[PDB]
Design a protein around this ligand. Structure first.
Ligand SMILES: C[C@@]1(F)[C@H](O)[C@@H](COP(=O)(O)O)O[C@H]1n1cnc2c(=O)[nH]c(N)nc21
Ligand SMILES: [Zn+2]
Length: 344
């Protein structure tokens, strides 16, 4: 199915360390053989499923391989090339900055390695516009969140468009929403866009209403927003009235068992009311997928025609964090490619 890879795509929810390919993972393993890490410890194969906690544990393993600014630079360049080769024309990468005293890496030089990877990818004339959202991990705590937000505010102004926002990710069972309200509001006031992971697990309704009050610019997952266990008509209505785009990750929810099957994924629910939604990979390496494969899975599961898949891809341009100028350029690119992608 060449249509899904040829189809121009936007990627808005992709975690850098979760997007590492098998090829790049093997190069990192070759550099650190003393770690005794194997490639099957970092990937969930087709037909296999793990718990959400088991997924989080795999990130601890991957984080041991990417410990220096050179590792972050190589990972950034490889991930960008892999997305561009898959037909992605605009990518918003997500990553939590980390210090590593053993290598001299700081949260600031972690971000600078990502920006350097984006700069080197432009020098190679790749057909992809890459932006960066600084991710706050719930496990880091509220003090590290304040430092990360301050760092993001500085790069938001200095990069003039490369750094566009802030994300709140990591274990949804760790910490309280109230602990992150102040730094997230600070970022919102500075002009940063917010992409918050919400309703990933059941029975977290109060916590979800607290983060929804921040008025995020995009919501990650929103799996249980309509569920009686952790969601309500009020939460759905709030997301509907405020037209908050949902970043939907099909393979991610199925392989982490937060959804029983592709057929029962909440994509169908939100698609039925034409609510703003974007198909995303989440962690293309950990979940062994590509954005083209996610589009194919959504099209085959929900019986969408190529023209209906085209409309989804074209509308997703509206939900990027970049300016109207970028949206306009992307729309022109899509309409130029359209007769080569859609055939009689
Ligand atoms: C659990 C993580 F914080 C991982 O440590 C990180 C990996 O990417 P990076 O931020 O580049 O290190 O991405 C986050 N992450 C990766 N996938 C997910 C996910 O499905 N849900 C949530 N809540 N967070 C996720
Ligand atoms: Zn995510």
């Amino acid at each position: 199915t060449d249509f899904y890879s040829e189809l121009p795509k936007v990627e808005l929810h992709a975690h850098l360390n979760g997007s590492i390919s098998s090829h790049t993972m093997k190069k990192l393993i070759a550099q650190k053989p003393d770690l005794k890490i194997h490639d099957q410890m970092t990937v969930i194969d087709k037909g296999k499923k793990r718990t959400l906690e088991e997924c989080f544990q795999m990130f601890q393993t991957i984080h041991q391989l990417t410990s220096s600014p050179e590792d972050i630079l190589m990972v950034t360049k490889d991930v960008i090339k892999e997305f561009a080769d898959d037909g992605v024309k605009y990518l918003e990468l997500r990553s939590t900055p980390r210090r590593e005293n053993a290598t001299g890496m700081t949260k600031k030089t972690y971000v600078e390695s990502i920006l350097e990877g984006i700069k080197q990818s432009k020098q190679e004339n790749l057909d992809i516009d890459v932006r960066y959202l600084i991710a706050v991990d719930r496990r880091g705590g509220p003090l590290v969140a304040k430092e990360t937000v301050k760092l993001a505010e500085e790069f938001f102004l200095s990069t003039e468009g490369t750094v566009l926002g802030l994300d709140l990710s990591g274990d949804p069972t760790v910490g309280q929403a109230k602990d992150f309200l102040e730094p997230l509001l600070e970022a919102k006031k500075a002009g940063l866009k917010l992409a918050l992971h919400l309703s990933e697990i059941p029975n977290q309704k109060k916590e979800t209403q607290i983060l929804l009050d921040l008025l995020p610019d995009r919501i990650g997952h929103g799996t249980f927003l309509n569920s009686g266990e952790g969601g309500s008509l009020d939460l759905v209505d709030f997301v509907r009235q405020h037209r908050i785009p949902l970043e939907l990750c099909l393979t991610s929810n199925v392989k982490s068992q937060t959804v029983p099957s592709y057929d029962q994924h909440h994509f169908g629910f939100w698609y039925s009311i034409a609510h703003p939604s974007v198909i995303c990979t989440d962690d293309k390496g950990v979940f062994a997928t590509h954005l083209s494969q996610e589009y194919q899975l959504a099209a085959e599961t929900f019986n969408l025609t190529q023209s209906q898949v085209w409309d989804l891809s074209y509308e997703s341009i509206n939900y990027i964090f970049a300016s109207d100028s970028t949206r306009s350029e992307l729309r022109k690119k899509w309409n130029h490619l359209k007769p080569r992608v859609l055939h009689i």
